[PDB]
Amino acid sequence: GEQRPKWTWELDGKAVTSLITQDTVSRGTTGKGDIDYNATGVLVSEDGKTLTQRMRTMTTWENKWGSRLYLLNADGQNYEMVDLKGKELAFDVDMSALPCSINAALYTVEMAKGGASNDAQYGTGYCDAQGSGSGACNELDIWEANSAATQLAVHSCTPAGRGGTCDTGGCNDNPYRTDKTFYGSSEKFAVDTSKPFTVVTQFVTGAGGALTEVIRTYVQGGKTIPTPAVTAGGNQYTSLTNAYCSASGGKPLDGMSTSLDAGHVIVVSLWASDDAGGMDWLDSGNNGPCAANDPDGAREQLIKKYPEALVKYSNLRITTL
Ligand code: NA
């Protein structure tokens, strides 16, 4: 029998336990095969607080593809549904083992609670902003990052549910575009990715209940670290707002605002592109210091150069603003 890891997190100060379940792609030809989480490199600490996700794991066979994980309700049949509007989501993260061209992602999508066919325990029904038909839905990329760069993105789609038209580029910010010393793997950076830090995201609503602002802050060494003010259309912005989204060539927050009312699934996906330059949008050119079109950045080479590449997430908390 499959033994899904239990991840304990905090919802308005109360200890909630969710199950961790891996995507159907990893479950063999039926897509409903059992997962050995030790073999896919997915570990929760004894205290239930820390999730370790490895890119490459060798046991009696070799996991070379990291993992896409969903938070599953304790019922073991439905995804753990969240509505982040008027909430803040915070987690502690160790990014120190994530080189250029890897993507440690923690995000939400408007997947159906039951997945494809009331079978969420098998990690079915995935959708995101890059999909088509049943594979297309609103995507809130809270976290897509390595030790060298990070991006926050809202991908509004209309209509909501599956199969809408999506902003594939998203309303997004990467602090490197404004300040190349904000985020990186030494004490020379405002956020030192060689050491653990807290990622805080506020999903601010208006009186009417519409999502109006997405605010990113970091905490490290007890210091609260705001994101650099970003220039778009000659104006400075300190958060994702409809004005910023418009000015920066993204779609506004409105599609996402409607979508979050349906409930989202929390996705934890550690991945690398099979193509050289597949992650350059995140961490190369004006988005980060990483080598562009790096053949060594392709998954198969990355896992050979950095066989211990992994992410740790701790103390996931969702709190009402
Ligand atoms: Na660069």
TrEMBL record:
GO terms for biological process: cellulose catabolic process. Disulfide bonds join 100-290, 127-137, 157-166, 171-245. The keyword Transmembrane helix does not apply. Belongs to the glycosyl hydrolase 7 (cellulase C) family. One of its GO terms (molecular function) is cellulase activity. InterPro entries: ConA-like_dom_sf, Glyco_hydro_7, Glyco_hydro_7_sf. Keywords: Carbohydrate metabolism, Cellulose degradation, Glycoprotein, Glycosidase, Hydrolase, Polysaccharide degradation, Signal. The keyword Glycoprotein applies. The lineage of its organism: Eukaryota, environmental samples. Its EC number is 3.2.1.4. It comes from uncultured symbiotic protist of Reticulitermes speratus. It comes from the Eukaryota. This is cellulase. It catalyses: Endohydrolysis of (1->4)-beta-D-glucosidic linkages in cellulose, lichenin and cereal beta-D-glucans.
